[PDB]
Each structure stands twice: as C-alpha cells, then as structure tokens.
Design a protein around this ligand. Sequence first.
Ligand SMILES: Nc1nc2c(ncn2[C@@H]2O[C@H](COP(=O)(O)OP(=O)(O)O)[C@@H](O)[C@H]2O)c(=O)[nH]1
Length: 183
Amino acid sequence: VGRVVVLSGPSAVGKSTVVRCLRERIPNLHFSVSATTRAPRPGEVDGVDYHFIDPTRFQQLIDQGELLEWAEIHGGLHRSGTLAQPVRAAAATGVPVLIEVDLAGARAIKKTMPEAVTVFLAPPSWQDLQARLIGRGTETADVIQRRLDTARIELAAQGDFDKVVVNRRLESACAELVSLLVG
Ligand SMILES: Nc1nc2c(ncn2[C@@H]2O[C@H](COP(=O)(O)OP(=O)(O)O)[C@@H](O)[C@H]2O)c(=O)[nH]1
C-alpha cells in the first residue's frame, strides 16, 4: 500500500520547488490532480492539469462525499478540490501519492482521510520568512504588515500537523519528504 502525504505551510514559504524536486526523485509519484469548475486554458490537459467538470456535477460530488476537501475560489467564481477516489485507487495499487494544499485544505483532509500524513513545511526561522516577505520592497507598508500578521497566525498552528519538515536547505527538506513518501 502506497503512503499518502499532504504537504502544506504558510501561504508563501515556497512549495512548487519542493514539489518539482519530489517528482524528479520518485519516478512513479502520483501528484494529486484536483477537480475544478473553471474552464481549461490552452495547453491544459484534462486528467493531467485538472479534472475539468461543470458546476452541477461538482455539487453532486460534494453531496456524495467524494471530495476529501474543496473550496470556493475568488469568492465563488468557481470551485476546486481533491477527489477521494483517485487517491485511494493509486494507494491501493502501491503508488505513493502527494497532495499539495493550503492549510484549510489540509485540515479538511485529516478529517476525511485520517491515514493521510500531514506535513507542515516550516521556515528555518522567523527572520528568514520575514526577509522573503519584505523581498524587494515593492509593496506598501499596509500590505507587508498584513502578510507578516498572516504568517504569524499560520506558523502558530503548525502543531495540528503530524510532521514538521524545516526547510533549511532544498536538498535535505526534499530528502526528508522522500523518506516519508517511500519509507
Ligand atoms: N482547496 C483547494 N484549492 C485549490 C485546489 N487546487 C487549486 N486550488 C486553488 O486555486 C487557486 C488558483 O489555481 P491556478 O491559478 O490554476 O494555479 P494554482 O494556484 O497553483 O492552483 C490557488 O489559490 C489554489 O490554492 C484544490 O485542490 N483544493
């Protein structure tokens, strides 16, 4: 049976890098393909980038308990979420599964699939995260303050997760995640 790992963290401690490294390291890793009700962009392939479904069908899936989690995107322009069945089928086939979501999505997945392993990717320090959020300083004081407040709230509840991987260095953080996925 394949492990299911749920990767989350602060909304900007940086995850598309770690995900890329993980997919290169584990040749048959299944990266969960979310359902959405927006339309495809040119270049997007149904079943690969998203599972493109229509608003009516998505509501069916909600009511039948077929989403591990879902949310309204841009205040309800459309919806996106994680489908239970592909994840369960991949795991029963023996293939490891990675789900990458925001913190609210990860909290919801722990309820619908408790055997999933939740991992919070933390920064090596507060000062490290703060420097990245100031960045080049092209954002106003009010926006930066709001991002610093948001990060503190999100960091303060890393205890709800099963595992904390501290992102000190790409190669060791990615190594720790490989151990969880195929160990
Ligand atoms: N909770 C939930 N949100 C999702 C899911 N997939 C994508 N989203 C959100 O939809 C938004 C925009 O999607 P898009 O611009 O195509 O690229 P993305 O941001 O990397 O997913 C992001 O804020 C995501 O957090 C999902 O499976 N579940």
